[PDB]
Design a protein around this nucleic acid. Sequence first.
RNA 1: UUCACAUUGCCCAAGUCU
RNA 2: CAAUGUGA
Length: 802
Amino acid sequence: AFKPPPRPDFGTSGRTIKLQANFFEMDIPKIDIYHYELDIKPEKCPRRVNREIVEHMVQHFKTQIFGDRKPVFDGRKNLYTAMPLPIGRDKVELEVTLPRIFKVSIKWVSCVSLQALHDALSGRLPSVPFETIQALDVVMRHLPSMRYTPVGRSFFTASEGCSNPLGGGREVWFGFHQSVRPSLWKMMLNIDVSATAFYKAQPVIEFVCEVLDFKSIEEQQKPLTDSQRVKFTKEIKGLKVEIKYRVCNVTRRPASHQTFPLCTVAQYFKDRHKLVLRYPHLPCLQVGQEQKHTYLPLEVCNIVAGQRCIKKLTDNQTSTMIRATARSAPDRQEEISKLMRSADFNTDPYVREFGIMVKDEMTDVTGRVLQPPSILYGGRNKAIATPVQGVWDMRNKQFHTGIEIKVWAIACFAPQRQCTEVHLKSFTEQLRKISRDAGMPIQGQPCFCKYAQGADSVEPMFRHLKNTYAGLQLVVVILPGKTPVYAEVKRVGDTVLGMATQCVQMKNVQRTTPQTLSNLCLKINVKLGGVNNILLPQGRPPVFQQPVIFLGADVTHPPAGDGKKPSIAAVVGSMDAHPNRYCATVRVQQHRQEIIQDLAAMVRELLIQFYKSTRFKPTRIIFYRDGVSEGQFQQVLHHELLAIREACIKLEKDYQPGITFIVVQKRHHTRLFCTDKNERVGKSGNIPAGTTVDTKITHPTEFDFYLCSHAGIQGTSRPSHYHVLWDDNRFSSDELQILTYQLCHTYVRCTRSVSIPAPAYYAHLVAFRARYHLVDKEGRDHQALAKAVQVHQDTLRTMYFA
RNA sequence: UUCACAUUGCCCAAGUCU
RNA sequence: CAAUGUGA
Ligand SMILES: [Mg+2]
Ligand SMILES: [Mg+2]
Ligand SMILES: [Mg+2]
């Protein structure tokens, strides 16, 4: 299956709230615009170089062509004009000299009708013509692509009149995201602010000082320590410098000592260029070809402007970045608004050429604030908790189903001197108190409590515990902060022996709080098979009247700059009618592949376990799929919808449950703000939990909505977006929106509505745990990685990822 | 490794020419 | 999840 279903209706549930979105309405003319194909030889040039080439070409060849007209260009092969050029489908070949000569061919390809775009935005046309949207994108990006430094769909520039140094030769550049989007109303310009790290365009000498912590360079006047030379080398290698060259290495010898087949560097610069070095003690930059011999003294070189820093920031740099860029929701809103008035898109000569107007104020949108579900607890009292502003508490409440803990052990890997037996005893007493209150009685002292040190001690201790203590339910593992012992505990517990473990940092043992201990109990109960709470059964949407399984799926990709690590696919599935308990599946797969390769096998496993747990076969499968961008919807849907079907088909016998396939995107560039100040919640001033938007700024024909399910603590809340790619079950907007919100209240690790539904959230936890199982380990290769993430038989059916 | 929220890191995007 | 903040 392929085509996403149309929006069935609009939601009606919940009180209204006035909102503003960072979407700016566009007025687009109803005219044909003209699309030309460009070919530039040689063709290996950076996109920015191509834009320059075309810019000169446009100025140079005006009299024959382009005379009044201002073309826009995508930096590759696509040029657009507001009026036609004098051409046929007949190519015209031009020569361009750039202060290098280029051969450029211009060939007519098509007319883009903006009239058709209007119709498609309206009801009239069934589909949105991508190519037309792409053309508008090229118009809006034309000038900023050359005026600023493009990064993704954003643009960055050095800030005028201020500096935000990060140290280490790095600094903060502020910028904005920009994208053109169709909507139920008009075309929209989506604008958000952002910031990212760039290298300071400074003398290399200054760069050296920042990297090596020299106040000034004169200290010392010796050549560098190899370690100093190595550290500097790590930082500058790959960066571009100008006198433009990319640095490929730093010499071991100083410019004075360093020679090449042609004498010394220093002497060459004395002789040929009549320059004498201030600092001939320092090494040279080797630039250009690694196997060649071009060397530049540090003193003659500048880091060239506008190079983004790709490397991870240090902890101090990160701290500085956070402080420089953190903003409340109202402050974020004002910054976007100020940016829009300053950007003045309507005096952009290219936007102007195409007769486009952009509104300078945020679009007004009405939201609805859904009512939260009630949360049912257990014990005698069977207390009901009522969320308010996205939060509830467990005070005077007991777990729906609490586990009695009879046999448990403590392993303390923190040093006895810092985490004493008194600490452990007091922590134990306080934990037992909180746990009894929660209906998860820890009915005695641990059966075993020992200090250990180092990763080598984990496996023999755990094997001893498993072999010795019949009925052992839990090992509480105390850690001295960040340590490789954690990953070893999870390797052994989750994958080697299949034993429940709960780690706790030493600092939270030495000094306990009731809220931390309570939260800890949330995880312990779940890990041991308990049910913390359930949605009030009678408050659930009607989908629950028949057996239904809820799946959450995510792929997590390796960090920036990584070239060989696998991506990790995780799928979880509900295992009861509440829905509360989940089981997990996980796979390693191709580097940076978003499509879940082995999804059919994963879903089959989950369906089998669902039937084993409930003795029902689902009549419906609700699949929440995290993190797929719009440009991947069709490709992902095609493989993954078919994989779900395949799993069903292979199980049985005309078993064809209805599938609802929903993409959840937490990371996108849509922000919503309270119009009225009295609606702003808390210090951060965000929209309230439950705020739902399915009008105005959403898709013109398809079934999508924003739901900000969580209370915003800090900064500006990201309202999660939900796009229904497939729906056999024919949900109404209301039912699916309410279902989705209720699922955000079923996440076991906290008494709060979280920002995405529990199944999607668990899928993330599963993928992250697999990554932990793979630390320093990432056909024969694939099998090794696959073995590493496979949990023990006894762990298979548990919520070990909690 | 108590937990959520937020920033970055993740598919698409972006980027790579003496 | 890691780094860094804001909170419970
Ligand atoms: Mg993902
Ligand atoms: Mg790409
Ligand atoms: Mg953190």
